[PDB]
Amino acid sequence: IMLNYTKNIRAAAAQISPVLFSQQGTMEKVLDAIANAAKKGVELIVFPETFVPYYPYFSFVEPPVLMGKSHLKLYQEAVTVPGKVTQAIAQAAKTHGMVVVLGVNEREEGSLYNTQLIFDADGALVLKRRKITPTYHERMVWGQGDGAGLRTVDTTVGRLGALACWEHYNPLARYALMAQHEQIHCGQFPGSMVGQIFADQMEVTMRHHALESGCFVINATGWLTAEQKLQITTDEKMHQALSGGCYTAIISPEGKHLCEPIAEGEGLAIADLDFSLIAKRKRMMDS
């Protein structure tokens, strides 16, 4: 629609663990999440970075010379342009009248991308973008998005913006979304990786986003169980590297947590976002 600050919206950030090595298994958890959330009248939900079929932890942890099996596998479980996954989600969204923000390892023509997808409450896919700069180990896996991906979308629940991980340090993206008055910003990070340091950094990064933009921020991060870490490597010495960095959270325009944030295990962070807060913020400063 056009821009309105009278809404009050129930949003959720989902920390979940995927199913290790099954698009379908992970997809069952996603649909379940949506449904559980619908039970509590959630109208917008954000999942972790590239959650489907699973984030590519292998690229962080295996030497390149041995990444082939893991790479192939991921390709086999990766998600097409539009397809089964898209329709399944479009339907959950339509059914529960929910806006859904989903990250996905997209395949196109033997290439992979980190792709953020946004579905409106009518089940329409109203935004598709690719992370612009895969960072570090991600460069072994994903290609680049365009910068034409920096637009917001009007949605049943307001105007949304989305970025992945350190896309948040890219100043073009920040101003792009701010200039378009994004009302609710959706961040996605991988989850269960590097440690406290990464967690502290996410939080600082995303809460500052809220502050500078003066918008709501919602951030989702995956989770791994000890069993799943083994599935990824038998080297227990690596397992610190696959722990921590979890900040599933919902942040007000003043930087406040609107609910207890999640760093461990698996759950929905849920809160009512009162849009008049966005406007009481802007009015309080002058110039």
TrEMBL record:
Any one Gene Ontology molecular-function term assigned to this protein's record: nitrilase activity
CN hydrolase domain segment(s): 9-275
Domain of life from the UniProt record: Bacteria
Segment forming the signal sequence: none
Sequence similarity: Belongs to the carbon-nitrogen hydrolase superfamily. Nitrilase family.
Protein name (record): Nitrilase
Organism: Synechocystis sp. (strain ATCC 27184 / PCC 6803 / Kazusa)
